[PDB]
Amino acid sequence: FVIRGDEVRQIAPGQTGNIADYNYKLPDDFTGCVIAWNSNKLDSKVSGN
Amino acid sequence: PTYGVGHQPYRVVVLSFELLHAPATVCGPKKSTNLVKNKCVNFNFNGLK
């Protein structure tokens, strides 16, 4: 999936955030881990995506 | 502060004794009686029963 900046912090288990709780909500007991990187090059529109 | 308990920092101190007791220098707290010779007694020289 694709989100903004602060919500990658919001993703972390236990932490609560509107996007986090209303969309993905990783469980408390988690055995796995995430990847993230900047995507401004291929996911930005001058008029707006 | 918002990180999970798993990723919170922890201070670790590791102690390494040397119980080969060659010079003995860091003897712990205790109290020393006199020395008596030519008598079957219970001796405790440097922590040795």
Swiss-Prot record, chain A:
Changing D6N: In strain: Omicron/BA.2, Omicron/BA.2.12.1, Omicron/BA.2.75, Omicron/BA.4, Omicron/BA.5, Omicron/BQ.1.1, Omicron/XBB.1.5, Omicron/EG.5.1; complete loss of interaction with host integrins. Changing V46P: In strain: Omicron/XBB.1.5, Omicron/EG.5.1. It comes from the Viruses. Residues 4-6 are annotated as: Integrin-binding motif. The chain holds residues 400 to 448 of 1273 of the full protein. Binds to host ACE2. RBD also interacts with the N-linked glycan on 'Asn-90' of ACE2. Cleavage of S generates a polybasic C-terminal sequence on S1 that binds to host Neuropilin-1 (NRP1) and Neuropilin-2 (NRP2) receptors. Interacts with host integrin alpha-5/beta-1 (ITGA5:ITGB1) and with ACE2 in complex with integrin alpha-5/beta-1 (ITGA5:ITGB1). May interact via cytoplasmic c-terminus with M protein. May interact (via N-terminus) with host bilirubin and biliverdin, thereby preventing antibody binding to the SARS-CoV-2 spike NTD via an allosteric mechanism. Attaches the virion to the cell membrane by interacting with host receptor, initiating the infection. The major receptor is host ACE2. When S2/S2' has been cleaved, binding to the receptor triggers direct fusion at the cell membrane. When S2/S2' has not been cleaved, binding to the receptor results in internalization of the virus by endocytosis using host TFRC and GRM2 and leading to fusion of the virion membrane with the host endosomal membrane. Alternatively, may use NRP1/NRP2 and integrin as entry receptors. It comes from Severe acute respiratory syndrome coronavirus 2. This is Spike protein S1.
Swiss-Prot record, chain B:
It comes from Severe acute respiratory syndrome coronavirus 2 (2019-nCoV). The chain holds residues 499 to 547 of 1273 of the full protein. This is Spike protein S1. Residues 21-43 are annotated as: Disordered. Attaches the virion to the cell membrane by interacting with host receptor, initiating the infection. The major receptor is host ACE2. When S2/S2' has been cleaved, binding to the receptor triggers direct fusion at the cell membrane. When S2/S2' has not been cleaved, binding to the receptor results in internalization of the virus by endocytosis using host TFRC and GRM2 and leading to fusion of the virion membrane with the host endosomal membrane. Alternatively, may use NRP1/NRP2 and integrin as entry receptors. The gene is S. Binds to host ACE2. RBD also interacts with the N-linked glycan on 'Asn-90' of ACE2. Cleavage of S generates a polybasic C-terminal sequence on S1 that binds to host Neuropilin-1 (NRP1) and Neuropilin-2 (NRP2) receptors. Interacts with host integrin alpha-5/beta-1 (ITGA5:ITGB1) and with ACE2 in complex with integrin alpha-5/beta-1 (ITGA5:ITGB1). May interact via cytoplasmic c-terminus with M protein. May interact (via N-terminus) with host bilirubin and biliverdin, thereby preventing antibody binding to the SARS-CoV-2 spike NTD via an allosteric mechanism.
